[PDB]
């Protein structure tokens, strides 16, 4: 029942592939808003609570939670090869498969394996969008060794 394709190249997705994914996850109701707002792969991966509520018209916190549940799954299994030269995806995944979801957040700030050692807690929260403290702490700890 998992949305197809599996292991998708979400960074390179255009509006059309975003549209298809919305259908697969049962969010067809939001296709129009996503289309109007021209959400592509890059924007989907970087979507915030605020943008989802205000710009895409998803008023319910519960609906947003359902949406982020699906987005997290997509992010966890996505192919980041185009944008992830140092393979941060595998580094994160080795710590915990669930951490792979943070790949785009890290590479979008221009982080890579070599720079990761220097990263701060604030940076992981504000710049990389890692909201769960537990996750931040684990990633921080493992980054300080390498």
């Amino acid at each position: 029942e998992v949305p197809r394709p599996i292991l998708p190249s979400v960074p390179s997705w255009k509006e059309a592939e975003v549209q298809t994914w919305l259908q697969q996850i049962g969010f067809s109701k939001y296709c129009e808003s996503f289309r109007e707002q021209q959400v592509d792969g890059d924007l989907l991966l970087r979507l915030t609570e605020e943008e989802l509520q205000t710009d895409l018209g998803m008023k319910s916190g519960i609906t947003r939670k359902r949406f982020f549940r699906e987005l997290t799954e997509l992010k966890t299994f996505a192919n980041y090869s185009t944008c992830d030269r140092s393979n941060l995806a595998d580094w994160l995944g080795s710590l915990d498969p669930r951490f792979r979801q943070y790949t785009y957040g890290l590479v979008s700030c221009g982080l890579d394996r070599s720079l990761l050692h220097r990263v701060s807690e604030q940076q992981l929260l504000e710049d990389c969008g890692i909201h769960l403290g537990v996750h931040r702490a684990r990633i921080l700890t493992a980054a300080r060794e390498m």
Copy 2:
């Protein structure tokens, strides 16, 4: 009997449970908002009031009283590989209710030692300071 597998519940099972606990009045809201097992387990005061239309603080308290019961006697085996449920339960039967909170952040027995008070509150949704402190204490001494 056998404990219900709430993490795997679909909308229909949530609907059934609302009827059983005398909250039929809220079936429509829960249906509209597409509340399944996962969302039911993770429900907040805020979502209950704003998104599900449960305006009364007293009614919400009654609801959480029922939800805590359900959480206490749920089967978490699908999502709880390290059996945090039994660990929590051994400390105090009432702590079993926090199983889904902990496993949803990817915690297990081995990782538990490193958790902070802030994390148990903000990430795991353990609101009572007393409960946090006891869980924290026991986690550091299993280490």
Copy 3:
């Protein structure tokens, strides 16, 4: 022998098992204390013993429609009396009631607050000021300080 509990003023029954009270017993108590005007609200909101013991200023004002701060103060004055003389045996295995009562009879009113957070005699030594305020609902600083002091001087070995 200052036992006004045998007096006519004091609501009947004495030494009631408030934790197990249902809507009907709550209704009876409201009548006795001269709060019949609020019977309908309490009925509609389905206030039982457990909810009565846990009632907050906010719930009383917003959910039960008691707009006056003075009326709420009168209400809490009555609820404090009830809480002081209630039977907590079903929910108080370690007898925190007597521990609190030995400190000061008026501290018995905090029993349900403490047992509701899963405190017992053994755990009491570790309790913090924040916990007594936020978790147990002990609003008077004087009371918190005395309870805290006595808790730290407990023999846990």
Copy 4:
């Protein structure tokens, strides 16, 4: 035993509160006090907030006149029913005007033996002693009290 000199305000009922309001020229407020069921206990514990919002006394000046009368009543009231350790005389010995704080202290369950441990925050928040000068004097004298 008909008429006492110092009134037992803690034991006053609605009717005695009503009579007192008349005597002090606040008849206009009798209905509000009746509706709100103000007895001796509630009268002694009345706050600025309750007076303005619940009793409808909108003017700060009117409230000041009211508290001027209440402070007198509190200063000369008989607290014997509720003041086992006689904190009234302790306060009075410091300054007669401080007797007005008796009910505030005994309502928190303070007594002579517990006074040494009381904090400035407690005197302000729990006992309702708003004047710093008064708090400081009470605190100072309380440091030379014997505890258990």
Copy 5:
């Protein structure tokens, strides 16, 4: 040009007369309605003057306080001032006599004055000028007791 007026004992009628003398007859009605007597007049605040007595202008309030300060400077405080703080304050600076009622209303006297803090003189006694507070405090610490 009243000689030692006993303002603490003044009734409504004397306050009314005073308002007339200082050219504030416009405010007689409000003062009457609010039942301002000597005690309330001496303890009047900016807030009460604006909100309860309807003196909307800050400039008018300033004029009023200018007159009140004069009255306070020349008043007889003997009913309420057993230790004669009035003369003590006046000897320091004639302009300090105006603070008598503020101090004696809190139960202060010559013997207690030394224990007061700058915050207390502001919050409890209504001495708004820091310069005045500091001078009163300093002199209080150096005074002769019994």
Copy 6:
């Protein structure tokens, strides 16, 4: 007879009115008249009073006003209210500081007391808003002959 430095502390409403005309603020004559602004009040005028009580809504207009008032304050005769001649003391430091005379004497400061003054007092009690000015006045005050 015409004095060189005007005795602004002793000015009455009529002199204030004249001054408003001279500086091109005739538009405000009515407000000043209604509010009964005399010399004392003119010297003590605040931004707030000027905006709310005198109806000068524009911050630019208020700036023009204060530009004129500062000049007046700088060259005024303070002899009635300045027994210790703080005006000349301030003037000796910098002629522009003479504008603070009424601020200092209104708190009851004089040459002998000046040594004890604090930064907070110069700001809150004396109305010296410019840090640069406060610092210079404070410094010079500490190094005075007591």
Copy 7:
């Protein structure tokens, strides 16, 4: 290709650029507000939303995506005497975008060593902490004369 001299752009060149990036809808606002190269380079979230009428946060993100590209491949020679562009670019090509922010405060290579984190954020408009930290680090390991 040729790198455009965006610092010297006039309204007309800004209008052309808006067309090329698919933001023709906003041409009128940018015209009305008289946005030239200097103002384009210094545009803030606030100005974009309030003054230029770009209500959607998503749309603003799309816009800044394009502006960042422009800034990355702009010619700054008129205003960048010490060639901070190449210094930034050597660290990471993506840092070239911060050139105008730095030169607008009157920073150059020689002054860069002394710069503070607060300055990079408030004065230079470098919003990403990661970027700030890297730029700060590299600035401290320069020539200190």
Copy 8:
């Protein structure tokens, strides 16, 4: 062309009006006239005054305006109000710093007093908003 050493501190309303025309802000002439903006007020103009009192609602328009004002401040003659020639001192540090002259002299600063100035004073009293500028001015002031 571009005016040589204009004596902006001594400008009257009429000169301010002319300058608004030259920089293409004729639209605002009326507001500036009504508000009686002269040289002294122009040099001391704030964001707040520009928005609320002069009716310049757009942040972008205000930015354009300050861009022009900065230019004017950079090339102005301050001699009437600048006895110690702080203008040339600031200019020698960096031509762009000349713009701060009126801010400094308006607080009564001069060359001799400059050494004692604090960061807070440069920001709050003198209106130097850029930290980079403050730091450089502070540094150079301590070393002369």
